[PDB]
Structures are given as structure tokens and as C-alpha cells.
Ligand binder design. Structure first.
Ligand SMILES: Cc1cn([C@H]2C[C@H](O)[C@@H](COP(=O)(O)OP(=O)(O)O[C@H]3O[C@@H](C)[C@H](O)[C@@H](O)[C@H]3O)O2)c(=O)[nH]c1=O
Ligand SMILES: Cc1cn([C@H]2C[C@H](O)[C@@H](COP(=O)(O)OP(=O)(O)O[C@H]3O[C@@H](C)[C@H](O)[C@@H](O)[C@H]3O)O2)c(=O)[nH]c1=O
Ligand SMILES: Cc1cn([C@H]2C[C@H](O)[C@@H](COP(=O)(O)OP(=O)(O)Oc3ccccc3)O2)c(=O)[nH]c1=O
Ligand SMILES: Cc1cn([C@H]2C[C@H](O)[C@@H](COP(=O)(O)OP(=O)(O)Oc3ccccc3)O2)c(=O)[nH]c1=O
Lengths: 446, 446
């Protein structure tokens, strides 16, 4: 039984869902209320605690790594990075050490899809996570990892029905804070009469697109999985042909010389471990801290950033076809040297001790951009199972003038980014968030 | 200036070249003679020497790694691998230590293409490499690395003309013997009047296809680059749709728990360092040795295998469409856990101390297969800059009965493998060699 290589293309179904905002379950206006209601019904709150009051976590003796005594969950370890300028790397030279999150296991982030009245809906979960700054955001249907093996609906993803897979791909998490970690992003259709429990809501993609314009609503794991949806390209031209884009990126992945090693947390230079936080000696980057989730239900470390981040794509129409200016970013926690990232991705406080000329390219342009050139803006936060209130302004900004890309940057269409999300290690988490925001703004312009 | 995303497709030109065996430069029958002649004109031979007589290599003091004093070239270091069976890995459990080759630099393997009388030719180089068992084989137009910076024609690849790129992709080298190394495989067209020096010959792809049937002729780097050629699929159906194949492989990349670390060579257990070789205590796997290339022109380490290898694809026609049975192989030197590999890939001596039931799946079937089911057979050798006479029987064998793939295996069409070679870390070096052999047998059946 062979089938066409392109069998069961879901692009028309996806497009229909993106165009529809009347969902079977709730009108969109209500969802904030439903969220507000689950936001309100949520019993759990979170308090900062000293490391010593962690239960079942400890700084293990020889490495000083922060680990769970069961071996489950993640660890905080050390990382040393050097980017060489030498005989075989373009540089410039960079060298540092930092804590890093490690968890050498792939988790499942799965969204279940099902047709109602001829239109696909997606089963979103109102989920409390301790680092969400507003506690409850909307997560994938299933968010689970095998070292924890009961999760509702995990049977639809472990293994998925091969006949019903829309998306199934490994995608990397933040390159600055995790060491080489990816999760399996999945979207799978069912025709089954699935149960519906209070924390779940069926939404069309058009409803999700409206919600994607809201601050701190569609959570980071959901935006990563939704960014992988395979829409049909409406304008199948680009400045680089797809071959030229892969050649450009090949050169970017080849031209650096970056050497990374994992080291004991106790060995990390430049960071100070106190009774309540581990922090950089000059107050940059991030802090590791500890929280209790409340009797106490559990305790765990979290990572918090030192400020609000800025993450933006500059957009230009080239012969009528919008392109975004990607950067082939080199981060210490990437598996394969570079990943494509947004035009600007940074926490501005980390550059504030430097002269303006050492700031990331385009940061000033983005920070000064007028409302009249801002095509999309919202504040989103990062995975609340690992990060405490890590927030950034996510922007899409029309560039008023043509820009000759600097080394490391290139004009790419959003459709080329969507195509690359069939594979791992091409599009980084922040760029996947902006791709989902671009797709949302295209489906349901505000 | 935007262009179609599919602009400048070379598939028709490639197909024309594959169908043509009358090349502009030499009829094929002669090339052995030309090779024989360059084989004969070659002055250099190779002698085994004690490690102590290496010039400019040494076992560096603290690590005992074998390194070139200039910092150029590669190193021999140690590797420790554990595959866990535990809470988050399917296993089975494996643990070992071994020497490994490291060179954290991407080299260029480039084939230059040019039309003569309306047909693309490719400029192959008769190149002596010290580990080639017959000294001279045919290499890409340009084989070079930036830590060595004069190489003829390197200007066509550094950087390539974006308007003339046929292939440009990073592909991994052997996972058992190199630590996470890939090289940039490139095919680039020119219309320039290129010089022609005695070590170079223009060949059509049909001529290369005939030569690919010869033992020890088209060298390993050439077969890797040629395997990346993007032919049009003649039968665009398969047992797995392309999405299903990527889902299957995603699960394979997710389901193992393999932890690898680089360690000092001096720390490797189970291997003995003598005055002339480093070897496994039970005579399995490989040896590290040293050679002089001859006054002495240079000296270097080489790795030699303990026996002739066996590398084979089993083939079945499924509804008329031939598929090969790939394995998602876990090797210690892979960057991303698994790569697709041939149905059988092993050195049989490494299993010979074990009962037949512990042998790799299908090895017995392949070793016993009749001539009447062998669709392709040749002996090829591995990169002669790093390996001394490492040879394997490469086979394509028609499977007489249907096979329900065991865990880790799946039926994939050669066209699906060709498509995946646009990206890194999908198709391993031995499978890329067999893909080039399959394409050769299809173009110019013997
Ligand atoms: C963590 C750290 C970084 N560095 C160097 C490494 C980088 O060149 C530079 C910037 O560090 P980064 O962690 O890349 O931060 P950044 O400000 O450039 O980028 C950040 O953007 C935010 C939007 C994301 O939410 C963050 O996850 C992070 O990616 O500082 C140190 O010197 N010491 C350190 O301890
Ligand atoms: C090197 C080594 C391997 N092993 C284990 C690891 C693997 O499970 C098993 C087989 O080792 P491998 O290196 O994978 O060899 P193999 O015989 O399975 O595979 C070989 O096939 C040949 C065709 C290729 O040319 C080789 O490069 C290699 O891939 O032995 C050790 O226990 N100790 C060692 O020192
Ligand atoms: C840290 C931690 C968690 N939990 C509880 C709290 C929560 O009920 C539960 C699961 O926590 P987790 O594995 O963090 O997050 P996901 O479920 O999102 O799993 C995925 C992990 C990675 C990729 C995808 C999913 O364990 C604890 O009880 N103690 C701890 O220290
Ligand atoms: C080991 C070695 C080599 N050479 C000389 C011998 C030869 O003339 C020259 C280049 O040797 P090399 O870098 O090994 O192989 P390529 O040119 O194929 O480079 C690529 C490397 C990796 C990927 C692609 C290409 O240096 C030495 O002089 N001493 C040595 O120890």
C-alpha cells in the first residue's frame, strides 16, 4: 500500500480554520473570561524561597549542580563558551561561563485537532505553571515528558496515529538558557469523541490568531507548536530561492568556530551563589532562584531574566513580497552552532554598560520605532515551568528604508521559515514565536 | 529582485548528463588508463612508522591526545559513550570508550560543473591520498579546509556564486570514527573557461555512473557530494508520506538516551598504546597507526579497520516502487543521536565473538545472498586522508520475501533519501555512498 509522497495535505483545512472565528465552544470575547475564570479558579500561588528550603532538590556534592534527588526533571549545571576568531573562525572572539538548564530528554508538546461542523478546532489547555507571570496561560493539549510516567490524552501522541499527523518535529528551546534541549512539537487530528474537562477548550485557528494578539495568553509551548503549521505559500517567490537560502545558512553554520563545554556549576566564574539566588557579578543576564508552589505542593528552581526583553522582526516588501530580516545567531546552548533568530533578540540591560556602537544591530532602530510602523506588538512570556516571569516585547516593524543586511543577516519570507520548521535546528524559539505572531496577524488582522 | 522559490531547477540538466556517456574529454574505457596513468605517474608511496618517528605530531602532555604541533589538521582524542535503558531511553544499554578523530572545522568538498556541447560535465580530480589502498582515486574538484590557507579552483567555492549553486549542504562523516564532524558538500556550475591541469578530467554524470560500478575508483568524498544531486522523482509515491517519514524519524531521534563525552586519549580504557599502534585489547574495531609519505614529504596518523566491512541496502518493490530498508542508527560520534544508515553496516569481525543471535539484524541474510539477488556490488574505501585501506563490500540486494521492519528500521524510497540530503544529519556517510551507487545503477545499469 504506497501513497503519494504529498498524501493528506492539510493546507486547505488549515486555511479554513484560520479564516473562521466562530468556534463551536466559546466566542473569542469570552475566552479571557474563561481564562479569567480558570485564572480565578486557580488555587496555586508561588513564593520565593531560599535554596535551603527546596524539598528534594540539592546542590550535589562533587559538581555543585542543582539537581532533583529522584533524578527526574532538569538540572542547573555550568557552561563555558568560547567563540574563536582564529585560523578557522570569523569571530569575533567571545568567552564566558554561566549556569545553564539541562534536561537530556525530549518532551512532548502536542496539540490535538478535530473537526466540528466541518472546521478544524484545536484543544487548548488552560494550564497553571509557576513561572507564568499571570499564573494561567493556554498550553498545548498535552505537555508531558517520559521521565514523569497520568497525563490526559497522552495516548494521542505516544505514539501518534501516522494517518493523522499534521506536524511532528523536534524544535530547540532557548539557546541562551538551555543546553542543547529540544522538545517534540506535534499536531495530530482525531475523529474520536474526546472527553472535555474544565481546563480545555476547542478553538479554531482564527480564534487562536485573535488570542495571539493578546499579552501573556497563548503560552510559549503553544506558540512553538503553532509556528510549525504548514500553510500553503500565497506568494511563492523570494529574494533567495530555497536552495540559495540553504546555501547561505550553510555558510553561516560553517564560518564560526564556537567551542562549548558543560562544566560543574560550582566551577562557573563570574557568578555568585547566595542563599536565595545565583547571579551574575555585574547584574546582567539572569538569576537562578527557588520557589514554593502552594501546604506546599512542590518546590523547584526557576530562572528569571534581569529585565524585559526585546524581540523583533524588521519587515520589508521586496517586489511586493514581505520578507523579514533574520539573523543566523550563535548561542552557547545550540546543538549545531547557529539557528535563525529574529532581527533583534536581546535583553537591553545586558548591553547598557557598553557604548551604543556595541549594541546589537538594529536594537536602537527597534526601540525607537513609531507606532505607525509597528505591525504587531504584544508581551509574551517564556516557558513557565522553567522561567519566572521572563517577558519580552515581541514586535513586527515595517522598515522605512531598504537595509543592506550586515554579516549574519538575510531577508527571508515567512513562508520560507514555515517550510524550514519541518526540520530541527533551523528556526529558534523566539523566531518561532514571531512566525506564529505573523501568521496570526495575517489570518486575523487587528 | 525576487525570483520563484524553485528558480533554476537543475533536474532536467542533471537527468540529461546522467543519460549521456559520451563526454567531451575521454571515453570511459580510457579513464582507468588515465587513472592508471596518473596511478602510474604518481611518485608517492606510504610506509608504516612508529609513533616516535612522526614529525610535528606528538602525544600532548596532559591529555595524551595525538596532535599536530602547528594546531592544524585533526587530533586523536578519547570518547566515552553510554546508551541508557532507563526511565527515558529505549536502550538497550551499551557503554564503551574508544579513540576518535576530531577536527572542529568544516572542510569544503566541491565539484565544479560546466556545460560542454549542451551537456553538464563535472571536473573530477585524480588525487593521491596516503590511505587510498591503490593510492590514486577520483576526488572532488576542490577538497580543502581553511586551517590550511594554494588550492586550484577554490575561488569557485569560497564563496560560491549564489546564482550557480546546484548543491550546498553540510553532511556528517563516519559516526564510529569521527567526533561530530561534517564537511560542506557543494556542486557549483560555471560558464568560465576553466584551466585544465593533468590531474583533472571532465566527465558526464553518466560516465561517473559507469565509474561508480568500479572498485576503489570514485572516492568517498566524491560519492558523498554526488549523493546530494537533486534528481526529479520518477515515481512520487512511497510507503510513508514525506510527513510520515519525518514523524517516524522524529520518534527515532527522541526515543534513545545516549550520553557521550570527549575525554583525554590517555584515559581511554580497553585500548592499548604501543610504539606502533593504538589497538583494542580484544582486536576489534580499528587501530590508530602512523605513516610516512615519501626524502619524507610528510608524516601523519591514520586509522585502519580490523577487517573488510559489509554495507548493504535490502530492496523491496512495494506496489511497484522500490524501497530500501534504512536503519536509524545510533553511533557515538553523531551530533543528533541518530542518522539514517544502510540496512546492514558493520565490520563482521566485531561480532564474531558473539552468538549469531547478537549479530546485527540482516547481516546473515546479506552475507549469504545469491548473485541472482545482488543488484549492485563493489568494494569502496573510506577517506584516504584519514583512513588506511578501510574497505567494505557495498551491496544492493533484492529481498526475496517481504520484511516487517524491526524496531529502528523502515522502508524508504531512494528519492526520499535524495530529498533529505538537502539537510544535514539525516543520511549517514555509508548510506550516502549507497544512494550514489543506486543512482549510478539507475542511470547506467551494468
Ligand atoms: C549569560 C552570559 C552571557 N554573556 C555574553 C554572551 C552573549 O554574547 C552576550 C549576551 O548574552 P545572551 O544570554 O545572549 O543575552 P541577550 O541579551 O543577547 O539575549 C537574550 O534575549 C532575550 C530576548 C531572550 O529571552 C534571552 O534568552 C537571551 O537570548 O553576553 C556573558 O558574557 N556572560 C554570561 O554569563
Ligand atoms: C569502537 C568500539 C565499539 N564498541 C561497540 C560500539 C558498537 O555497539 C559496537 C560496534 O562498533 P562500531 O564502531 O559501530 O562498528 P560496526 O562493526 O557495527 O560498524 C562499522 O561498520 C563499518 C562498515 C564502518 O566502516 C565502520 O566505520 C563502523 O561503522 O561495538 C565497543 O564496545 N568498543 C569500542 O572500542
Ligand atoms: C520541576 C518540578 C515539577 N514538579 C511537578 C509539577 C508538575 O505537576 C509536574 C510536571 O513538571 P515538569 O516536568 O516541570 O513540567 P511538564 O509537566 O511541563 O513536563 C514537561 C517537561 C519538559 C518538556 C515538556 C513537558 O511535576 C515537581 O513536583 N517538582 C519539581 O521539582
Ligand atoms: C594530515 C597531514 C597533512 N599534511 C599535508 C598533506 C596534504 O598535502 C595537505 C592537506 O592535508 P589534509 O588537511 O589532511 O587533507 P585535505 O587537503 O583533504 O584537507 C581537507 C581536510 C578536511 C576536509 C576536507 C579537506 O597537508 C601534512 O603535511 N601533514 C599532516 O600531518
Amino acid at each position: 500500500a504506497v501513497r503519494p509522497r504529498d498524501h493528506h495535505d492539510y493546507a486547505d483545512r488549515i486555511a479554513l480554520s484560520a479564516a473562521t472565528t466562530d468556534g463551536v465552544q466559546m466566542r473569542t470575547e469570552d475566552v479571557r473570561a474563561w481564562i479569567a475564570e480558570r485564572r480565578d479558579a486557580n488555587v496555586f500561588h508561588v513564593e520565593r524561597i531560599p535554596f535551603a528550603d527546596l524539598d528534594q532538590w540539592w546542590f550535589e556534592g562533587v559538581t555543585g549542580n542543582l539537581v532533583h534527588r529522584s533524578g527526574r526533571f532538569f538540572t542547573i549545571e555550568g557552561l563555558h563558551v568560547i567563540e574563536h576568531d582564529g585560523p578557522h573562525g570569523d569571530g569575533p572572539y567571545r568567552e564566558w561561563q554561566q549556569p545553564v538548564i539541562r534536561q537530556p530528554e525530549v518532551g512532548i508538546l502536542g496539540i490535538l485537532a478535530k473537526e466540528f461542523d466541518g472546521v478544524l478546532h484545536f484543544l487548548m489547555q488552560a494550564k497553571m505553571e509557576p513561572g507564568n507571570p499571570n499564573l494561567v496561560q493556554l498550553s498545548p493539549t498535552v505537555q508531558a515528558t517520559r521521565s514523569n510516567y497520568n497525563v490526559k490524552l497522552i495516548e494521542y501522541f505516544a505514539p501518534p496515529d501516522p494517518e493523522r499527523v499534521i506536524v511532528d518535529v523536534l524544535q530547540a528551546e532557548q539557546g541562551s538558557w538551555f543546553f542543547r534541549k529540544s522538545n517534540r512539537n506535534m499536531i495530530v487530528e482525531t475523529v474520536d469523541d474526546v472527553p472535555l474537562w474544565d481546563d480545555f477548550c476547542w478553538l479554531t485557528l482564527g480564534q487562536i490568531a485573535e488570542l495571539m494578539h493578546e499579552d501573556e495568553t497563548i503560552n510559549m509551548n503553544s506558540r512553538s507548536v503553532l509556528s510549525c503549521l504548514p500553510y500553503q505559500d500565497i506568494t511563492p517567490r523570494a529574494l533567495f530561492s530555497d536552495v540559495q537560502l540553504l546555501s547561505w545558512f550553510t555558510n553561516e553554520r560553517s564560518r564560526h568556530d564556537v567551542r562549548v563545554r558543560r562544566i560543574p556549576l560550582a566551577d562557573v566564574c563570574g557568578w555568585k551563589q547566595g542563599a536565595e539566588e545565583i547571579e551574575h557579578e555585574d547584574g546582567r543576564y539572569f538569576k537562578v532562584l527557588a520557589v514554593a508552589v502552594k501546604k506546599i505542593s512542590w518546590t523547584q528552581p526557576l530562572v528569571e531574566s534581569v529585565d524585559l526583553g526585546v524581540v523583533a522582526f524588521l519587515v520589508r516588501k521586496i517586489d511586493g513580497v514581505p520578507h523579514v530580516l533574520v539573523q543566523a545567531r550563535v548561542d552557547g546552548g545550540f546543538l549545531d552552532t547557529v539557528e535563525l533568530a529574529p532581527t533583534v533578540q536581546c535583553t537591553p540591560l545586558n548591553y547598557a554598560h557598553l557604548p551604543a556602537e556595541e549594541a546589537p544591530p538594529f536594537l536602537d532602530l527597534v526601540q525607537n520605532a513609531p507606532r505607525s510602523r509597528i505591525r504587531y506588538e504584544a508581551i509574551h512570556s517564556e516557558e513557565g515551568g522553567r522561567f519566572l516571569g521572563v517577558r519580552a516585547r515581541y514586535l513586527v516593524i515595517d522598515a522605512d528604508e531598504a537595509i543592506d543586511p550586515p554579516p549574519g543577516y538575510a531577508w527571508v519570507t515567512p513562508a520560507q521559515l514555515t517550510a524550514l520548521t519541518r526540520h530541527g535546528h533551523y528556526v529558534n524559539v523566539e523566531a518561532r514565536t514571531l512566525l506564529a505572531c505573523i501568521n496570526a496577524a495575517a489570518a486575523q488582522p487587528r
